[PDB]
Paper text:
For transcription, FluPol interacts with the C-terminal domain (CTD) of RNA polymerase II (Pol II), which enables FluPol to snatch capped RNA primers from nascent host RNAs.
We attempted fitting both the transcription pre-initiation conformation of FluPolB and the transcriptionally inactive apo form of FluPolC into the cryo-EM density map. Overall, the transcription pre-initiation conformation of FluPolB produced a significantly better fit, with clear density for the PA endonuclease domain. Part of the PA C-terminal domain also fits outside the density, but this region correlates with an area of poor resolution, likely due to particles acquiring some preferential orientations in vitreous ice. Our cryo-EM data support a model where vRNA promoter-bound FluPolC is dynamic in solution. Thus, whereas FluPolC can indeed acquire a transcription pre-initiation conformation, this is likely only transient. This revealed that, in the transcription pre-initiation conformation, the PB2 627 and NLS domains would lie close to CTD-binding site 1 and could potentially directly interact with the CTD peptide, hence contributing to CTD binding.
Residue numbers in the entry:
A (entry chain A): 97 to 145
B (entry chain B): 1 to 636, 653 to 749
C (entry chain C): 1 to 485, 496 to 740
D (entry chain A): 194 to 533
E (entry chain A): 582 to 722
Write the structure that this text describes.
Amino acid sequence: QEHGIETPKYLADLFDYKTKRFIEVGITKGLADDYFWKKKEKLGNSMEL
Amino acid sequence: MNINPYFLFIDVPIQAAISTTFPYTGVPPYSHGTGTGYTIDTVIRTHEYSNKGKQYISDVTGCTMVDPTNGPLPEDNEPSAYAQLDCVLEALDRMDEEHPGLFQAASQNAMETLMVTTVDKLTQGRQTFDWTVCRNQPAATALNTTITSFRLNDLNGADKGGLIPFCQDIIDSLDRPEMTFFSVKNIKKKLPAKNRKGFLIKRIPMKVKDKITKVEYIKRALSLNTMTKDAERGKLKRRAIATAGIQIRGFVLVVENLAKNICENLEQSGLPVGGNEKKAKLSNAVAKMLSNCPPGGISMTVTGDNTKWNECLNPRIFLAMTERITRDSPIWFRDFCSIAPVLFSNKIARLGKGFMITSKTKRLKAQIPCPDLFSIPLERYNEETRAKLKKLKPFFNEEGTASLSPGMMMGMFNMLSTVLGVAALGIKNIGNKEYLWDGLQSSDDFALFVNAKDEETCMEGINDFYRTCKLLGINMSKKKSYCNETGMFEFTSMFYRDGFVSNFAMELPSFGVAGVNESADMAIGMTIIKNNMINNGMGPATAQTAIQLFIADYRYTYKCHRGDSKVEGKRMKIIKELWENTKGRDGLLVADGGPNIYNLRNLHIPEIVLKYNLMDPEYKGRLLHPQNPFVGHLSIKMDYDAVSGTHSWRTKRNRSILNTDQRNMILEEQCYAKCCNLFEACFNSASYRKPVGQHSMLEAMAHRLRMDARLDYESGRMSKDDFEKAMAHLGEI
Amino acid sequence: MTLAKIELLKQLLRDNEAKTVLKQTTVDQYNIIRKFNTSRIEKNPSLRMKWAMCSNFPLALTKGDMANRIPLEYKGIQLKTNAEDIGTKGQMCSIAAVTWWNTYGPIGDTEGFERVYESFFLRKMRLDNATWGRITFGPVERVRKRVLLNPLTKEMPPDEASNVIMEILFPKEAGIPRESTWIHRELIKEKREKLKGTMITPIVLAYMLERELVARRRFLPVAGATSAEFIEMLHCLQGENWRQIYHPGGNKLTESRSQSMIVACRKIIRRSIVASNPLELAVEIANKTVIDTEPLKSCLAAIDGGDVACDIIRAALGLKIRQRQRFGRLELKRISGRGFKNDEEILIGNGTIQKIGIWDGEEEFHVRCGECRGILKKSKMKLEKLLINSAKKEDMRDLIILCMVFSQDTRMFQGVRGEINFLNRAGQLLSPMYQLQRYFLNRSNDLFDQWGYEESPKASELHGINESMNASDYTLKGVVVTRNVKVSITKNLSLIKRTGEVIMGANDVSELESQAQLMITYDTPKMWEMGTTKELVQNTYQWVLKNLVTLKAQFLLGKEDMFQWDAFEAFESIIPQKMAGQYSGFARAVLKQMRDQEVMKTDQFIKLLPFCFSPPKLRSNGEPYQFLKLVLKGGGENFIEVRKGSPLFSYNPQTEVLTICGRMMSLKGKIEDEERNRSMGNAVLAGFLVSGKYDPDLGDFKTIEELEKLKPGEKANILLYQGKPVKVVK
Amino acid sequence: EDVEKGIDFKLGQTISRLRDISVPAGFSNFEGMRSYIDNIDPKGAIERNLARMSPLVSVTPKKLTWEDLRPIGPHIYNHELPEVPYNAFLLMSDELGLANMTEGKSKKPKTLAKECLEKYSTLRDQTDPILIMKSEKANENFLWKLWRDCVNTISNEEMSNELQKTNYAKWATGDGLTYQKIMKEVAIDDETMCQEEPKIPNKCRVAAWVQTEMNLLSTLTSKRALDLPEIGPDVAPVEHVGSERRKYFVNEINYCKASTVMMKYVLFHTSLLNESNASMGKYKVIPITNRVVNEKGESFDMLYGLAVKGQSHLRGDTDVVTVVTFEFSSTDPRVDSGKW
Amino acid sequence: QQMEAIVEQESSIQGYDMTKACFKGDRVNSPKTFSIGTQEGKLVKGSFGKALRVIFTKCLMHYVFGNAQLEGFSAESRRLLLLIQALKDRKGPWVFDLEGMYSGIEECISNNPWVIQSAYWFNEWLGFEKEGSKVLESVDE
RNA sequence: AGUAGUAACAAGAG
RNA sequence: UAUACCUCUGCUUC
């Protein structure tokens, strides 16, 4: 609200002050590419994955 | 010529002019002094109705217990508490068979409600028996003390927020060998002073840890307080009512919620049906019974009322009722629901103040506490009390309390008992005899319709209903109940005569000034007229008269007569000035000696809103000054529509506490008040919405203020000085 | 402000008590420690206030500068005292202090006040702009119903409303985003813009918002008007014995017109049916009926709703007839085909028998649901075709489901699991089809699975879709998604087309007589005629009593001249048409008994004379139908007993007082001398007279089935009212 | 790693042991009742019980006939009892109001009573007591002294309406009559102390003064007493009908006797309550005032008598303040002595 | 209210404001008359205003003599009233323990003037009704 | 005394 | 014991 942007519908993990962007951290076991595009389905492009 | 006001009844029938048989302009009877006699009466009678049952000593409490359930049936019309379990279970089975799905659905709803129910829910129980100080306290305080006490015994269920862990801690606290709790005691401390002698002694209070043994704790947890009921209308002699502890509240809430969820779906239960809807139920329920047996079918209505309603119904039945009703529910919920009856089955009754003995010769008087009740020759008590105290003995406890296994207290399981009544109404017939009964139930008050071919059968149907109710521990009042041919009847002071008539008297006391404040009482005052015009049959003339009478009462009570009038008074002296100063006088509120602008058509409109355009800017500015000191910190039974202005004030606190040992609670209060007032400044929504979280109350404020600081800095509100200072402060915290 | 909060926090944290409180107390428990106080519940505030007002300094001030702006005294009068209040820890004061503050206090900012309390002012304009009408004295049937007390801005559930309020007032503390925000974003935007500059405390704004968002619905005695802007004035609208025409200002809803319109038309029809040349009455009345302010003409013309009666009237005044239907959310218009309802018993999927009205005959409708439009072709329990357009998924889905249910397809009926006899929140049983709607709107997977699929259309403009409302080669069986988007009326109110076929049935309207929404007015003499059972009954018997002088005289002169009179047409509109004749034939005979023979009973004459209007119907034998009580439409109460009195009609011969629906009338000075020991058996059954008194040898009290089968000149026992045996002969 | 999330709520030994002994007769423990309820089918139990239950248990119904309705309260006709005595707070029918014509606007009560007594000086100056009848346990001297103290106190030139706390005032008020509270430890040892037998209302018989009170209070006068304030202007027809109805309904009561009596009670209690709280420890004199308008439309202030307010440190709502009434009358008590 | 109910009920019957009619009478109707009281053992007809004032007076006396005795007496006697109404309407009313009703009522008659008078009035009225019953008892039969 | 009515007040407390 | 012809209290429960 202070920065003047849309509120993420899910709870993000971090927020970058210089970029004014929310960040979502993921810790996978196998491949990262698998865990990435699965998140893309939920978060679209709201948070930085 | 001797006037006789009864002779009106020659012309107008009694239901048509029933309002004239209610003396509600008169004064209601209040109690005086102790109620111990009335309590003891109840204790004696409650056992009197079950003394042929099973007597046994409770190995837990050490108290004398009496059990009527599944006992010998009565051979007389004396109030019987000897209910038969099987019959109750059958009566239930019938209800379940005719209302399938309800029993489990209600339980699921109640369960899913319970799971969501938090602890704060308990704060809205009004007067609650505080077991720590053994006094009736505000529910919130009684709860807070119990939580703070539980914390000392390593029981932090409350910290989770939900009700379940708290209740768990409650049933767990029974197992504790010694229950510890706080008790405040004072300390002198020399504070510096400019006082010849350079110091001052102020008694600083400090909390002390105090212990109670398992049994003595359990006895308190099972105890119920008692007091005489004041202002009870339509009755000569007074009677006693009880108050419960904090423990059982959570367990009762669920049971009553369940019984509510059940009752809502029943068609022959008048609970929790609004008085307006009760007619919608009743008139229809009658309409059904009317057009059912045309051929000489005598439909009779029975104006019912039960005797010893609370004193005959036994917890042991309610336990079975919960056990049956919760059939499909999981075990934990059954165990949860089973508790409150189990507690009420082993409850203890406190006997109020005691008895006052006196000497007229010496002009001396003294109260004898219930513990010291027997520390005196019984001959020194009066003739009746001497008889009572002798009968009390077998159920009397050393610490001055009365064991009371059977019976219920006045207003406890209203829903669940109403269910048991409906269960009686659910049978409708016995032995395939040529009749059918139906009716409406409401706690101790019931209305029974009976259809049959000849009245000789109807009466036997009624007799069957009576003899049936006996088996449920429900006792009909042969003295107060009466039967007649269907067409007219009475139910909870609502009178049916080919249609429910008005009973304007009933609501008449409400017309007076309520006693909230100048702002509210007006709105309330007009709204009551507005409503009574609609529901209770008040014509426009009488309404317009009431509009006048209320202003009359309003202006005297709040001493705010017309600014043009010459009535003297401290306020009036200023009101007159305001009258002289103000231009838009019709804009002035009555509270400010303004003219009454209300009539029939604008009762539903707030006075400020009505007169707003007629006010002067300075007057409305002062009257509605946003930060005026008269209105306190507001926080969101009947509600009203009013505007927050200077007349929306609150009165001073009762000061009698100042010169007693409870002074502490003022500091204890304000100590919270400061934290909450700040927490509200950190979280503005706290006043509206209930904050949620099991984390620290400080942490939230720290984080929130940190973010506020950071954003106020980076946005460009605070300067580097203020930001660094803020972060420097927060850093220490 | 943050710095001040942190500073106060640090100053507070110094106090070990406050520190421990803040550290130990939880965010949940805040809700507890807030309500902690020494205060006690006032059990007699009415008294305690009257007492307190006689004290010197009853009020408590808030600690602050605005309090300090109040002086200690003023021209001798003590305004406030130094002594603090236990609760507020601010100075205490007398009520006078209020009167001072209002007179010489600081003038504060009131900008925004009107927008904040707008909700209330809207009442004031709804009254100020209103226009009043006539007041009329006469009976009023009040039906006790749950109604909305005040008109809202936008009705939401409490949970949904609180979140919106939270979004408006405390956006940072709203927590988890809900869908509501997206739905009411414009409302939020608006209220945010309207409530920006004001200085009033948020806790008040939330209250006023909640007042105009959350609904207050309560049971009340209502008659005619039920709209909120009428309910809020209900106390003035009506009584039990009077009526007041009231026209509230401001704009009124369209649906509110649509609601009343139907009731009005139905009520016109129900009356005009009984009188010969129905069209004449229907037109006469409909010409001069008024809905609040709009005439029924203007309404029927402007609104494109109606149902059955509306079309019939529409064709009676002369305008198009929109044959539109509403299945819950699904809105239909008729393209072609006129089906017929037939009550059958269907064994539904879950394994239960259900009595449902199946619609026989082929039918084609123009269909619309929310935003999704289409065309529906159905036959007896079969979806023949469903040609819809593309739209939002929920609308497409719900359209297809509502069409599937509306079509009464066996594939739908045999797609039920569990139970579908759930009540509504109040505890009322829904109708067979609407239950299936309410069910399949939720659980649709069974339907979609049980439905079946087929090849999609390969025409370029046509497409097929699957269960998740997406394009597919395998479409639902009978479903298609396409890219492309005179009459006359009979005397007896049936609508005929040029080809002779009839499309509207006069006997095809609903008998259900519900309460209107707006003020239903009849700008004609004799309004009552379009009234409730009891209203008509009462007015009728009143009209009888009013003219009893002539009516009782002519009954010794004009044979069947009285039985038909203008006033009774109304009354008859109450009576079940399946009994009207049977009653009339009986009443006329029992009356003719009192005429031709020397046994009169004015109280009975008055009771029966209205029932004799409808053309009579005797039995095969020529004898009439015997009765214990004459039933009327609606409410088990509404019946006229023949021997006994009744909820509608009873007579007290001690005072010669006639009771009509509760109202008292005096027959004294209008009763013959010999009616003292004149038994009632001589006017209870037609062609029967009292011989002696109850003779045990005759046996029991013989019922009507026996009495009708008794041969002429044969004694029998009859029970008048309870405790009055009589011996009667044919 | 997945697990089901069941609700954790289990009973301890104490509460379980309590539950075990919270069962109907014929059950070893709770589990027995639980299984019993969950399993067995009791259909037939009701009738099987009703069969074995004693016939004596019944409702014993009887059809009501008029001769069964015997007159209620057979003792009220018995002359062996004392007829019920007048026990109201103020006088009703027997009232006598000293009338003083005014502008028709509020003045100070003392000034009012002063001017009224100024008009009717002949009675005010009467210091010579002519005793007609005397309440059994009253004190002529104290009462008359109290009356004179009232009259003179009100008649004087100063503002205060306070009475000197004399002996007669202390008697009439009942000073120090409360018993002294003491420790239970003492009272227990003191064998002379006993619980008082409660005072039960006496059994009175019928008295005609009630009948007459009813006959008179319901009668019309030429004097209106009500103080009905203003209301908003009429707009809707209903309001005009109401307003037009009030002219018939209200005036019919306002012109009658009971109205004035009522207004007297109201206006009196209004001030009495105020003095009771404002001046707790001060004995104060309060006039029995009532403004009245005659058919010509002239505001007469009516003074029916003077009342002495006792000591009013009223804590509990039921706590009593003793008030001594001195009320003018035209009734010769010797006529109906049983009334007084 | 109690009388405006009658004015409204009447106005319902004749379709206009029957106030003036009830009070003073008018062109069409006679004035309302009620059985107001007794006189040497016979009824007396009082006007609407008197019937109003009688109720107002009664309501005043309810306050002026209001206490537990009045509450108990009114409450418990109201039942017997209702029964008497049931009898007046011939609705064949049954009772289960009348001595209970009576015992319940009569304990409330001790030293309250209005109670003790109301009992007397009640008995007088109850007396005058039984003369009225003799009209109904032999109807038809 | 009186209020009042199955038990209280007619001041309490430091 | 004293301060105390003082002080506090009027629904604040023991």
